[PDB]
Amino acid sequence: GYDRHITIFSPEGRLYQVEYAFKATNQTNINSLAVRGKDCTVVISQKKVPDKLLDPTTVSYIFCISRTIGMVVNGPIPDARNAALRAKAEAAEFRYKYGYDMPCDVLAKRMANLSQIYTQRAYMRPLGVILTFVSVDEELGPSIYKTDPAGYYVGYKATATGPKQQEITTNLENHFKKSKIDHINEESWEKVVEFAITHMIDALGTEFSKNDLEVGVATKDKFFTLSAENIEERLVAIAEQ
Amino acid sequence: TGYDLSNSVFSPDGRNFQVEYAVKAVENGTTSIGIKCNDGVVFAVEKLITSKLLVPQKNVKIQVVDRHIGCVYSGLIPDGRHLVNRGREEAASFKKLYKTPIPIPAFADRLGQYVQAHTLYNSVRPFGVSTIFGGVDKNGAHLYMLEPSGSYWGYKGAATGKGRQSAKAELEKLVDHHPEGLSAREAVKQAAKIIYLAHEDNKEKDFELEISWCSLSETNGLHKFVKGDLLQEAIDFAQKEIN
Amino acid sequence: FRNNYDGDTVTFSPTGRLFQVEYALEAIKQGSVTVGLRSNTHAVLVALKRNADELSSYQKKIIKCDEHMGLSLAGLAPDARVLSNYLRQQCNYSSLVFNRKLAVERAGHLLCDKAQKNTQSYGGRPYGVGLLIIGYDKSGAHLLEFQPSGNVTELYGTAIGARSQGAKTYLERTLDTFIKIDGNPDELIKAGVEAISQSLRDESLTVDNLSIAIVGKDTPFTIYDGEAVAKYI
Amino acid sequence: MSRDAPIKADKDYSQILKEEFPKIDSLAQNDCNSALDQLLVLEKKTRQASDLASSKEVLAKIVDLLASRNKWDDLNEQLTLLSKKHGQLKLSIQYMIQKVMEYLKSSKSLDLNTRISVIETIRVVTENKIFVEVERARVTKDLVEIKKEEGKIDEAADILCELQVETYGSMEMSEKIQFILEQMELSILKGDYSQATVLSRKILKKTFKNPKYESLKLEYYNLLVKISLHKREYLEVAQYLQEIYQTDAIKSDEAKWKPVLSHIVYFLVLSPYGNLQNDLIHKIQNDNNLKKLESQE
Amino acid sequence: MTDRYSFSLTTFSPSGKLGQIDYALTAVKQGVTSLGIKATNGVVIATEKKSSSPLAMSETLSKVSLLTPDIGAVYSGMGPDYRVLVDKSRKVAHTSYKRIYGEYPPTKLLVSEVAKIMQEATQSGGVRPFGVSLLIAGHDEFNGFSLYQVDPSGSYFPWKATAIGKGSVAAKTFLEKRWNDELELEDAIHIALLTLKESVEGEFNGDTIELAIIGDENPDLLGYTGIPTDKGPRFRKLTSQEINDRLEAL
Amino acid sequence: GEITFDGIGGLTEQIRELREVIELPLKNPEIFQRVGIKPPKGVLLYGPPGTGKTLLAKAVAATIGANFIFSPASGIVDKYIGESARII
Numbered sequence A: 001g002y003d004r005h006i007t008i009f010s011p012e013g014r015l016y017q018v019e020y021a022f023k024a025t026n027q028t029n030i031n032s033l034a035v036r037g038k039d040c041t042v043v044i045s046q047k048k049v050p051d052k053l054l055d056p057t058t059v060s061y062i063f064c065i066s067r068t069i070g071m072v073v074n075g076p077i078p079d080a081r082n083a084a085l086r087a088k089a090e091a092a093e094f095r096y097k098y099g100y101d102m103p104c105d106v107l108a109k110r111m112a113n114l115s116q117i118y119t120q121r122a123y124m125r126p127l128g129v130i131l132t133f134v135s136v137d138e139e140l141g142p143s144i145y146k147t148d149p150a151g152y153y154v155g156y157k158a159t160a161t162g163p164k165q166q167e168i169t170t171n172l173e174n175h176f177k178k179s180k181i182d183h184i185n186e187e188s189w190e191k192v193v194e195f196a197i198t199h200m201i202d203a204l205g206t207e208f209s210k211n212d213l214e215v216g217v218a219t220k221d222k223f224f225t226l227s228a229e230n231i232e233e234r235l236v237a238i239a240e241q
Numbered sequence B: 001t002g003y004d005l006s007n008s009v010f011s012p013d014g015r016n017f018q019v020e021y022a023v024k025a026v027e028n029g030t031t032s033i034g035i036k037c038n039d040g041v042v043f044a045v046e047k048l049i050t051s052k053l054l055v056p057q058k059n060v061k062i063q064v065v066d067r068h069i070g071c072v073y074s075g076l077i078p079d080g081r082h083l084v085n086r087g088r089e090e091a092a093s094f095k096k097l098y099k100t101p102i103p104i105p106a107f108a109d110r111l112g113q114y115v116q117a118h119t120l121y122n123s124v125r126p127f128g129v130s131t132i133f134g135g136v137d138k139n140g141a142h143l144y145m146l147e148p149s150g151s152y153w154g155y156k157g158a159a160t161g162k163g164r165q166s167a168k169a170e171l172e173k174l175v176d177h178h179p180e181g182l183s184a185r186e187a188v189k190q191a192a193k194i195i196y197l198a199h200e201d202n203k204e205k206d207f208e209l210e211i212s213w214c215s216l217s218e219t220n221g222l223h224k225f226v227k228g229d230l231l232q233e234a235i236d237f238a239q240k241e242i243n
Numbered sequence C: 001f002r003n004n005y006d007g008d009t010v011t012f013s014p015t016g017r018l019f020q021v022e023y024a025l026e027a028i029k030q031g032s033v034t035v036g037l038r039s040n041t042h043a044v045l046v047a048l049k050r051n052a053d054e055l056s057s058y059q060k061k062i063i064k065c066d067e068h069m070g071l072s073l074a075g076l077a078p079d080a081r082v083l084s085n086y087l088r089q090q091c092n093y094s095s096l097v098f099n100r101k102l103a104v105e106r107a108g109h110l111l112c113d114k115a116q117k118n119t120q121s122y123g124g125r126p127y128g129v130g131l132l133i134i135g136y137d138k139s140g141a142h143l144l145e146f147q148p149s150g151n152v153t154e155l156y157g158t159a160i161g162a163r164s165q166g167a168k169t170y171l172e173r174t175l176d177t178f179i180k181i182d183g184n185p186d187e188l189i190k191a192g193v194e195a196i197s198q199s200l201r202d203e204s205l206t207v208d209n210l211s212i213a214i215v216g217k218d219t220p221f222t223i224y225d226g227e228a229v230a231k232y233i
Numbered sequence D: 001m002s003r004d005a006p007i008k009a010d011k012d013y014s015q016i017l018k019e020e021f022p023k024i025d026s027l028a029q030n031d032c033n034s035a036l037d038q039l040l041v042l043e044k045k046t047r048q049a050s051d052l053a054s055s056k057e058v059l060a061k062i063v064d065l066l067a068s069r070n071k072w073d074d075l076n077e078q079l080t081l082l083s084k085k086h087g088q089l090k091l092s093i094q095y096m097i098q099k100v101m102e103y104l105k106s107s108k109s110l111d112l113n114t115r116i117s118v119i120e121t122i123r124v125v126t127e128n129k130i131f132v133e134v135e136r137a138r139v140t141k142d143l144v145e146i147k148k149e150e151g152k153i154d155e156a157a158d159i160l161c162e163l164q165v166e167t168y169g170s171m172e173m174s175e176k177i178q179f180i181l182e183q184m185e186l187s188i189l190k191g192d193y194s195q196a197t198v199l200s201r202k203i204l205k206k207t208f209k210n211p212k213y214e215s216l217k218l219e220y221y222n223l224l225v226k227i228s229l230h231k232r233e234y235l236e237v238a239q240y241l242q243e244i245y246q247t248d249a250i251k252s253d254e255a256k257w258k259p260v261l262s263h264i265v266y267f268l269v270l271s272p273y274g275n276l277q278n279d280l281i282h283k284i285q286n287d288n289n290l291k292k293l294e295s296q297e
Numbered sequence E: 001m002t003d004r005y006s007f008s009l010t011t012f013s014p015s016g017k018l019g020q021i022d023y024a025l026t027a028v029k030q031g032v033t034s035l036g037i038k039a040t041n042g043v044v045i046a047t048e049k050k051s052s053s054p055l056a057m058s059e060t061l062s063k064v065s066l067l068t069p070d071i072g073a074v075y076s077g078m079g080p081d082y083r084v085l086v087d088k089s090r091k092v093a094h095t096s097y098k099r100i101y102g103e104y105p106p107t108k109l110l111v112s113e114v115a116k117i118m119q120e121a122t123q124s125g126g127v128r129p130f131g132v133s134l135l136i137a138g139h140d141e142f143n144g145f146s147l148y149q150v151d152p153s154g155s156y157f158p159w160k161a162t163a164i165g166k167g168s169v170a171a172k173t174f175l176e177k178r179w180n181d182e183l184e185l186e187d188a189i190h191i192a193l194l195t196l197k198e199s200v201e202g203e204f205n206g207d208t209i210e211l212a213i214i215g216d217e218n219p220d221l222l223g224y225t226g227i228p229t230d231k232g233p234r235f236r237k238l239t240s241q242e243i244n245d246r247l248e249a250l
Numbered sequence F: 001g002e003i004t005f006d007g008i009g010g011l012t013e014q015i016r017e018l019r020e021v022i023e024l025p026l027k028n029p030e031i032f033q034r035v036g037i038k039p040p041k042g043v044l045l046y047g048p049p050g051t052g053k054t055l056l057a058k059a060v061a062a063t064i065g066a067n068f069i070f071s072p073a074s075g076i077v078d079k080y081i082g083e084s085a086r087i088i
C-alpha cells in the first residue's frame, strides 16, 4: 500500500513505518544487557564468533562514544554506524560550545529530536537502530537511557534487549525486590560485573565463553573494554553449574 | 511490492528491496580474493580475456590508491571505478589536514558514511559493489572488505564474486598452517592456485592472473604490482598441482 | 517492462539489470557503422558519412576534438555533443596547468565517471552514445571504446554500429598483419577501407561518403576526404 | 563452553586417579576433608559432563560415606551443593544421587539415623522430575511408614498424595498403581473419604483385568469396600465383591469364593428394597455357587 | 484509501478538510486524558502518565514541561513531536519578546506564537502536522489567569474548562456538575483528582499522577531574593507526597 | 498402536502440557463441575504443517485408551451439501 509508504501521517495516525523499524531491530538477534551497579555501569553484549574469514574480536556492538559514555547498538550494522557519527560528533561540539563535558541525559534528548526530523524528511528512511547510552554521569552517577528507533526514549534502572529480552527482565525485576534497592549489590566494581555475567547466563540458559561476550565497564572518567581474559576470571566459578 | 517501486521506504522486511538486489550483482563480478599474510597483504583477481583484440595488462583491474593502499573491486565496473576515485579525494583531504597517511580503518569509516547516505535517500541510487581493500599503514597490515550494505569488518581472508566457494575452502588451509598468515613470497604462489582452481568455474572465457602486494618485508610497505618473472612462475605452481 | 521497476534508473529489477541500458546499446546498432583499428604508431578511423537525400551534403560524423584528438559517434546525437565539448575542456586544463597533453587513458577514467553520475542521480540522462576516441600521447597511439555503460577498453581494433559482423571478422583475420605494420601510414589506411567494405551491404564505396581520420606518432589529427581517400579507395 | 582438549584430558585423568582410588579411600580415615578435595576439583572442570567421567571415582566414595555412623552426615552436605550449582547434566550426577537414596534402605544403621538423612535428601531432590523423582517417592515411603505408627500420619498422607497426582510415564504402570492404592488406605485412617474417592477415579479399571494386575485387582476392590461401608453404602459394596468373584483365581476355587459370596448376600438385603435389588439378586439365583451354601440361600 | 489530494497538504481536499489533520486528532484521542480547570485564583492542570516498561523509570517521562517559569504546558500524544515543538516554542518566544520587549510574554501572545509554528507544519507539503494537541495554561499580570487549547491545525481558543484524550467526554461533564469558575482553586484540585480517578482505578498513586498549579507567586522560588518586585514563579509543580496529601482531602 | 511418545522429539513438553487440558476433564467431568467452572470443550491447535499436531492428538488418545475418530475434511470438500451431509 501507498498508505504504508507515506512518511506523512497514516490514516491510522500511527505510522506503519514506525512499527517497521521495530521489526528491524531484532534481525541481528543480539541479546544485550545493561545494569546499574552502585558506582559502576556494566554493559554486556553477545560477541558473535563467525568463520575464520572474519576476525571475531573486531566484530563488536559496544562502542566508546566519548569519555564515560559508551553505546550498545541493537539492530543492523550499517545503520548503527550512521547513527554513531552524530552522537560522537555532538559530544565534541557541546564541549566546544559550553566548555564542559556533556551529560548523558542531554545527548539522548538531542538524538530523539533528530529521529523525529527523519520522518519529516521525505527522502530519508528512519534509522532502525536502538541506542542505549550507559555512563557514570557527572551528577547522577550510574545512568541508563534507552532510545527507540521511533524516537521514544526512556531511562532505566536495568534493561535487556532482544527477542529473548523477556526472560532476562524477569530475573532482574525479582532480584531488585529482594534486594529492596535499584542498584546491583557490592560497591566493588569487579563482582558486579560477575553478578551481571551470571544473570545473563541464567535467563538465556546458555553458558557463554569469553569468546561469546564482550564486557564494557564504566568507571569515573573512562569507558573502556576489558580484556578477553578478564572475562574468564569471572566466568570460571560460574561455569561449573 | 511498492517498496521496490519507491526507494528508501522502510519495508516490513527492515531492509529496502532495492538495496537487496544491489548485493546480488556483486556475484556477477569476477572471482576476486584477498589474503592476509603476516607482514602484508596480497590481492589477486581473475581477469577474463574477452578476445584476442583485448590488450594484456592495460585495463588492469587492480588500481592504486594513496601510496600504500591496494584496491580491487567486484560488480558494476562503472560504479566501482567512481567509488575508487571518490576514495582518493577523501584520502586527500585527510593527508592535507592531519599531515599523515590514512589509517586503513579510517579509510573504511569514511567510505562507510558515503555509502550509507546514498541508500537512506530516494534520490541517490544504492551502490552495488563489494570492494576488497587494504595494505600496510602505520598500524601495519590489515585486510578489510566493504559490503555495499555498508558493513565492514576486519578479515583474515576475503573472497567474493561467483567462485568464492572454491576460494574460501582453499583459504581455510592458510589459517591452520599458520595463525600468523603464510610468508608473503610463498602466499604469491598459493594465491595463483586459488584463482586458477576458481577459473575452473569461469573457464568459459580465457583469463589472465594479476596479483599485487603491499608488504613491509618485500615492498618496503609501499604498493606494487607483482610482474615479470614472479608472476610467470606463479602460474606454473598452480598448473603443476591441478594436473 | 514499461514503467514500474526498471522504469527509472534508481529502481532495481530483482535481479538488478537495467533494461534501459540494453536500449541505449540499441541506439548504437541503429547508429552509423564505423571501424577503428591501430598499430603501435597510428590509429585509423573510418566512418561512413550519412545523408538524407542527394541534395543533403554527406554529413561528417567524425569530429576533430583537438589537434592530437578526435572522436566518432554512433548513437544519439544530443548526448555526443555534451560529452564532446567536455573532452575538449579537460584536455585544455592539463596543457595549461600541468604542461602535458591529456593522456588518452586518463581522460577515459573521468569520462566513465561522468556517465555513472547520471545513473546515481534522480533524473538526468545516462549518456546513450558510444564513442571511438583516437589519440597520440607520450604512450603513443591509442584507440578506446566508450560504452553507454561508461567502460573504457583499450582494444587493437573494434567496430560499432550497423552490420558489425563483416568488419569484425575481417579484423580478427588481419589482426596480426596491421599490428606488425608500422612506419607505413598509407597501408594502415588501406587496411581500414578494406575493413569497412565487409560491414556494408555495398551501400557506397564513393570517395564522397568515406571519411578517414588518422592520428599517430606521425600524422597529427587530420581529416582526409575526396582525393586523399581516393588513393586508398 | 568452547575448547575440545578439556574433554580428552579429563577422561584419562579419571582413569589415573581411579587406580589411585585406594589412597583416597584410606586418607578418609585420617581426615574425610583431604579425601573429598582431591575429587571435587576433578569434577569442577569447566566443560559439562566432566562430572560423568569423574563420577566413577565418586561411586566408590559414596559407599565409604554411607558406611559409618559419622560419615553419612558429611554425605548429606555435598550432594546438595552439586545440585544447586547447575545440576551439571541432570543424568550424570543424579545416577550417583539415586544410589545414595537406594543405599539408606539397606544400611540398617538405626531408626534415628534413617529419619534424619531422608528429611535432608527429599527436599533438595524435589527440583528433578526424571529418574531421581521415582526414587524420591520410594524414599519418602520410609517416612510414611515411620509416621504411620505415630499420630503424624495426617501430615505424611499429604506429601505422598501430592507426589503421585503429578503425571509419570517414567514409572511403569504396576508401580504407579501401588503408590496410589496405599494412599487410599491412609485417607481411610485420616477420615477424609471423599479424598480416597477422588483418587479412585483416576485408577483405570480396565488395567486391573489384565492378568499381571490380578493381585492388584483384588487389593483395589477390597479398599473400595472400606470407603462405601463406613458411609453405609451397601449398594456399592455388592458390586465390588461381585467383581472379586469374576476374578479368575477366585472363581476357580471353592474356598476362596465362599466368604466373598456370603458377604454379597448380606449387603443386597441391607440395601432398601426396590428395583436395583431385584435385578442384582436374581444374578445370584442364576448361579450354582450360592446354592452350594445353604445358610445363605 | 483516501485521495491523493487529501494526503497532500499542498492540495485543496475535495471536502477541504485534510485527511492529515484528521489523523492528528485520532492520535490525540489515543493518548492520555489530560485536563484543565480554570479557577478565580489559579489554574490546575493534571494528567496520568504512561506506566511503560516495569523497570522503565516513570519520573523521566514528563508530560508537563514548563515553557517559562510562570507558564506550563500539557499535551496528549506522542513524545517525539512534543519535545521538538517544545524547543521551538521557547526559542521563537525569546527572539520576539524576551529581547524586544525584554520580558516574559503575555499568555495570549505566547499562545499566538505557538499556533504559528503549528500552522507551518500543516502548510508545508510533506511535513506532517504535529502529533500533539496542547493545553497551555498560564498566568500573566495583564490578563490574569488564562486557559488555552492549541490545535495542531494552528487555531487556538480560550475556555472555561476543556479536557482532551479518551476520557474527554467523561471529564468535561463531571467538571460542569461540580464546579464553576467563581469557585476557588482549592476545591478544583480535589475535584480534578476525582475526575482523573474515573479514568483509571488500578493505581492512582502520586507516582503515576503529575499534578501542578499555576497560581500565586512563590517569592522563595524567585531564587535571587532581596529584590521583591520581580514576580516569583507562578507555576509550582506539586510532588507525589503533596498529591497524596491532596488525596486524603478527597 | 500408540505413536511412541519417545519418538515425538522436540515437542516432549507438548505432550505433558496437553493432558492437563485433555485427560483431567475427559475422564471425569466431575472434578471441573465441583470446582465450579463450565467444563471446557473446544481446543484449537496450530503450528506450521509438519510439526505433528495430528500426531500429538493421537499420542494422547492412545494413553487414555479413549476412542479416536480422525476425519480429514479436505478429502470430502465440496461447495454445497452432498456427500458431507451423509458423513457427519
Ligand SMILES: Nc1ncnc2c1ncn2[C@@H]1O[C@H](COP(=O)(O)OP(=O)(O)O)[C@@H](O)[C@H]1O
Pocket (backbone or CB within 6 Å): F007, F008, F009, F010, F011, F047, F048, F049, F050, F051, F052, F053, F054, F055
Ligand atoms: N514430533 C515429531 N516426531 C517425529 N517426526 C515428526 C514430528 N513432527 C513431524 N514429524 C513427521 O512429519 C510427518 C507429517 O506431519 P503430520 O503428522 O502430517 O502433521 P500436521 O498435522 O502438523 O501437518 C509426521 O508423520 C512425522 O513423520
Ligand SMILES: [Mg+2]
Pocket (backbone or CB within 6 Å): F054
Ligand atoms: Mg493433520
